[PDB]
Write a protein that binds this DNA or RNA. Structure first.
Lengths: 49, 124, 187, 34, 49, 225, 147, 52
RNA sequence: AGAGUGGCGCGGACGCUACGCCGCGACGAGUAGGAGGGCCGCUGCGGUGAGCCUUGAAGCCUAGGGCGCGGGCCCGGGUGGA
RNA sequence: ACGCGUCCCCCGCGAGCGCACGGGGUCGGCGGCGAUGUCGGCUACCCACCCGACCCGUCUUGAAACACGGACCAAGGAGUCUAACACGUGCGCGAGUCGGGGGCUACGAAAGCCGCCGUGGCGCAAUGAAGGUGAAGGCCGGCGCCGCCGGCCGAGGUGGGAUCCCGAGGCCUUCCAGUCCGCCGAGGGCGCACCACCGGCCCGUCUCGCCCGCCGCGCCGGGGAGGUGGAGCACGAGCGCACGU
RNA sequence: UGAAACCGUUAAGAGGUAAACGGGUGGGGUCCGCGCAGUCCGCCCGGAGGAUUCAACCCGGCGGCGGGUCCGGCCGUGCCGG
């Protein structure tokens, strides 16, 4: 993870890891669902950059 | 290792600033702010940092937990020290020395937790 | 003024390995240390080899390495190769050796390890025996590359046996006026 | 160390479930920036 | 498939085998000489003979 | 632990000192014994000539062993035999000099360069001032100075030339390790002559400077060192 | 790249690495292979002996598939099977021998090079050179021919 | 002018080749046609094989 | 600077971009021509700088002040207007 | 030359203070002059004087030349793409390697995929104009010589060759044995690459001699000793990509 | 936007060996220092005070570690069974 910071990214608050998710993200057609979703996992700050 | 990814970062990171024959580093927990192998603030398995506290009053300190080096929202651990200038520095010397927590930094974190207070104190 | 020349006195050895790859440059760091602070020689020869260029460090084969340890005596002993360890088809029976090379090619892993003999790399010969004790230092042949069969005395002169650069061999391509006793001369 | 940990799987709300995957070995192969 | 197995050479340098097979250090510096002419200078001249 | 080991650590220090005080007296008793030679050899050349002149005889004094040589012409435009012979004597630049032992192979080298040099038979004063003031070494492929007696004892040693006193005997009397104790030295570093030259181009005998001088080379040294 | 080459270190120097005296001028020797028996003689005859002249008979409409002869040595004649015809054949009592067909792995004539791994072998081959016969028979094996 | 050791060799650029040069910049959406008009073929011939 | 069996006061500068620092010697002309290094310039494309700009961008001008042997570059002032 | 306990020709840890020609300099020494007229400022603008200094490019043994181009300023203005070759250097895979044509399914005309898409290329085999030929041997038995019968080891020397391996003897703190763990070592061992010399095996050719093999018994096929021609063997380094000359 | 060549006019400066240039100093200008009573940083001692405050003891939360011999679970370029 000390590499991913040095590509600028905004990860200081990201729960973990290489991040994984339940298979219920494959079928989202709405951006208002996918934005709310990006704020849950704590990485909105990278979009905001 | 640490010793690996240095070879990768050394001369390339988004935290590297060169010019005028000088060379610096703007990484969270580098205390001396220089691109180096003592002093980088992410690489290793244990970390010390000295940041200027929330509002004006005090100083805040940053250890890195030995465990979960892959779990960054619960990796660092924080405490605030808002006491007298000689006595505040009792704590910081009692963190590095008596934990055996990375005994190189000792004399960096005494000169950074004494030019964060010589600030918030009122000016000449 | 002083009568000297400054003619050859910059020496042309190689101080450090041109390649970039990191895992070879942590490799060197180890042995830089290990050369200077010991009283054993091996180390110094190995560090000097960790610099060289592909052609000055050519693939040693299994059946040469096999053949170089069945001489009288030398046993309880390993085989270091600062290039590689490649297969050989015309050889069947495989003992239980010990190897320590940089790339072990992906069939000579399935041969020596299946005979009951381990293979190392250059940071498992750094703790196992720091100075150097219980080793035989092998290399492959540095006169394999064809190139050496265009060199020497130039192919158009008495007593010489070089291959010249010819567009293709056939029955007419460089076949007449200096190869035959009948067509002017042969050499 | 090829040594592999255990990888937790988050729900689309953020809190973790109780399901894990063993690490795909690709993630242990060498970094080679050249 | 890896060239070297442990890249960690902060820690390989300080495990039981490598620090029982190397000679001791020489951390002293020896700065250059100013040749006090012993035909002139006394104790310089009492050191030679 | 320690209280034992610290007292054993106060027995090895007094040993390495006692290695000096048994060696410190020997530097004195080597020097006071060569002083006996330099009155017993000096007055035994005035002994024979009186006691010949007594009985209407003659006494020819001892023909030389040793000779200092100084390079006086420059470095431009030079014939290819002479560049080779001046190299072999280590005179590679102007106003530089060397010790040289004598024989037939050593003189006939010094007739081929005999308009690029000045040489002569040096004395007990023109051997020591040179070796005291100027004299450097050649240790680790470097010209490092001699302000000590663990450089000459440390390189040579095995030949029994330890202090600054034995470099006077072995050269001023050409003894039985001379070669090594003279390829020991880097060649000397004289500045120019203060007074001057008579006429650099020509042979002493005509007027100037070049070629051998048997007993007035002592004049171009105390002017040059 | 056009930056790491020689021609940047020469913006500033006059003659650009082709001469003060005798310049870069168009074609000094004659174009292409000139002077073959004149003024570029020596060279030709000192790194290409035998360029100049005839030899042998000329075959006209040469069809090269008729001349088609692949090749397989002894040392590595066991290189046409799996690793299963040899380990079970070495285990036998009554003394059997597997059938290596060489026409099946693109090999026509069988050549006589190195050793042999000594255990019974029947050998189909379109052409037997005289050492491929005597090496396989002394160990113990047939030599069947094919067309 | 041959320098020294170095293979002799015969080029056929003595004609005006440049006036007849062929390039394949087409190469990618010439494939993507065939495959299309390929894809037309067998919708025209329904249950008959496209293998013909 | 070896390891054994018997006869009051919790304190001690700097370092090590290891592609860095440090350490002791000898030498340093160059035209044709070779070779390295350039935190010397000029225009475009992927990355990066939570870069900068109508509270004044680029270009120009400047008996204003600074930087490197050098190629060149940093800051004061006035114009200019994206 | 300066306690004493024994060996002799020859009659192994004392105590502190102090000064210095001693492994590159410091005063635990001083004094003036300070607000609208003076302090400082090497650098960049004008003047003055002493020493030095002929105009640049250029061909040329020789240019300040009575050799040629140059009145001044802007803006342009000259070793380049692609097709061969070769040697060096980086990188992947390694007796192999490579899909480059063909296929399958906004950035993308990209990008992942075929394997019973490796046909094919270069490489693992030479040599002869050809028909063609086509790459070790030893050492003991069944009958001092053939023709055949079994069993064992095997890619052969000598000389020089980076390192390893065996270790006579020693590596001190009162002495007298006893060890483990390391390092120092007289001389003596296996010899990796690179060579120098000696033997051998495959094609071509030359001279001498005797026996083999046979569905077709020959103007038929095969073996043996010594010279000689080669771009040959002799436990393999090639192939694809990129950079430089 | 408005460069250089080349003009015209104001200030200064200078001027008989065509001018211009290199080394070295002196004189005068221009600006600029924001110059004109002169440096901070610890520990120590004396003499004037502020602020509810220090050691120690119990009360919760967190790390650094090994409990040379507490209990499980999870990996493996580790094997031996079925």
């Amino acid at each position: 993870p000390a590499l991913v910071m040095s590509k600028g990214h905004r990860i200081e608050e990201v729960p973990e890891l290489p991040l994984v998710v339940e298979d219920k993200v494959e079928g989202y057609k709405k951006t208002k669902e996918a934005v709310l979703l990006l704020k849950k996992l704590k990485a909105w700050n990278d979009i905001k950059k | 290792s640490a010793h690996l990814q240095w070879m990768v970062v050394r001369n390339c990171s988004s935290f590297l600033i060169k010019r005028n024959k000088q060379t610096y580093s703007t990484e969270p927990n580098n205390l001396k702010a220089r691109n180096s192998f003592r002093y980088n603030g992410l690489i290793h398995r244990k970390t010390v940092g000295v940041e200027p506290a929330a509002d004006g009053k005090g100083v805040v300190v940053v250890m890195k937990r030995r465990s979960g080096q892959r779990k960054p929202a619960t990796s660092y651990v924080r405490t605030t020290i808002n006491k007298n200038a000689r006595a505040t520095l009792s704590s910081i010397r009692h963190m590095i020395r008596k934990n055996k927590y990375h005994p190189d930094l000792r004399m960096a974190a005494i000169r950074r937790a004494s030019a964060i207070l010589r600030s918030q104190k009122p000016v000449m | 003024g002083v009568d000297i020349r400054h003619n050859k006195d910059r020496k042309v050895r190689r101080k450090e390995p041109k390649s970039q790859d990191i895992y070879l440059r942590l490799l060197v760091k180890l042995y830089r240390f290990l050369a200077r602070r010991t009283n054993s020689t091996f180390n110094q020869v190995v560090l000097k080899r960790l610099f060289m260029s592909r052609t000055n460090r050519p693939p040693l084969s299994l059946s040469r390495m096999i053949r170089k340890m069945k001489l009288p005596g030398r046993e309880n002993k390993t085989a270091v190769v600062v290039g590689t360890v490649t297969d050989d088809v015309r050889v069947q029976e495989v003992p239980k050796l010990k190897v320590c090379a940089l790339r072990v090619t992906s069939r000579a892993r399935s041969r020596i390890l299946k005979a009951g003999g381990k293979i190392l790399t250059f940071d498992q010969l750094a703790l196992d025996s720091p100075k150097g004790r219980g080793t035989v230092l092998l290399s492959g042949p540095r006169k394999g590359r064809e190139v050496y069969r265009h060199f020497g005395k130039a192919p158009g002169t008495p007593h010489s046996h070089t291959k010249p650069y010819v567009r293709s061999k056939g029955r007419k391509f460089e076949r007449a006026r200096g190869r035959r006793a009948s067509r002017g001369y042969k050499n | 160390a090829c040594a592999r940990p255990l990888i937790s799987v988050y729900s689309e709300k953020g809190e973790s479930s109780g399901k894990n995957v063993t690490l795909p070995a690709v993630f242990k192969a060498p970094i080679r920036p050249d | 498939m890896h060239k070297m197995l442990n890249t960690d050479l902060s820690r390989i340098l300080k495990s039981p085998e490598i620090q029982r097979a190397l000679r001791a250090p020489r951390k002293k510096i020896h700065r250059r000489v100013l040749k006090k002419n012993p035909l002139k200078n006394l104790r310089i001249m009492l050191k030679l003979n | 632990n320690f209280a034992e080991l610290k007292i054993k650590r106060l027995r090895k220090k007094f040993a390495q000192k006692m290695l000096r005080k048994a060696r410190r007296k020997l530097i004195y008793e080597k020097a006071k014994h060569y002083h006996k030679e330099y009155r017993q050899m000096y007055r035994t050349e005035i002994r024979m000539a009186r006691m010949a002149r007594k009985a209407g005889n003659f006494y020819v004094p001892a023909e030389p062993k040793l000779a200092f040589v100084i390079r006086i012409r420059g470095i431009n435009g030079v014939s290819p035999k002479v560049r080779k012979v001046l190299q072999l004597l280590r005179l590679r630049q102007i106003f530089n000099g060397t010790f040289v032992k004598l024989n037939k192979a050593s003189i006939n080298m010094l007739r081929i360069v005999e308009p690029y040099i000045a040489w002569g038979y040096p004395n007990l004063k023109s051997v020591n001032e040179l070796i005291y003031k100027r004299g450097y070494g050649k240790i680790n492929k470097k010209r490092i100075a001699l302000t000590d007696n663990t450089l000459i004892a440390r390189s040579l040693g095995k030949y029994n030339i330890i202090c600054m006193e034995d470099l006077i005997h072995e050269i001023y009397t050409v003894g039985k390790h001379f070669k090594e104790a003279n390829n020991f030295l880097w060649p000397f570093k004289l500045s120019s002559p203060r007074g001057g030259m008579k006429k650099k181009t020509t042979h002493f005998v005509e007027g100037g400077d070049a070629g051998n001088r048997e007993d007035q080379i002592n004049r171009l040294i105390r002017r040059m060192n | 790249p056009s930056r790491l080459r020689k021609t940047r270190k020469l913006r500033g120097h006059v003659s650009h690495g082709h001469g003060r005296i005798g310049k870069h001028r168009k074609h000094p020797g004659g174009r292409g292979n000139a002077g073959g028996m004149h003024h570029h003689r020596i060279n030709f005859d000192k790194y290409h002996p035998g360029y100049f002249g005839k030899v042998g008979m000329r075959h006209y409409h040469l069809k090269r598939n008729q001349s088609f002869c692949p090749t397989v040595n002894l040392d590595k004649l066991w290189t046409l099977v799996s690793e299963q015809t040899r380990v079970n054949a070495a285990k036998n009592k009554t003394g059997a021998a597997p059938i290596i067909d060489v026409v099946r792995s693109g090999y026509y004539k069988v050549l006589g090079k190195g050793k042999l791994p000594k255990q019974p072998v029947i050998v189909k081959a379109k052409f037997f050179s005289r050492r491929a016969e005597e090496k396989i028979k002394g160990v113990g094996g047939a030599c069947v021919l094919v067309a | 002018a041959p320098s020294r050791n170095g293979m002799i060799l015969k080029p056929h650029f003595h004609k005006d080749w440049q006036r007849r040069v062929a390039t394949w910049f087409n190469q990618p959406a010439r494939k993507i046609r065939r495959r299309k008009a390929r894809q037309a073929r067998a919708r025209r011939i329904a249950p008959r094989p496209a293998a013909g």
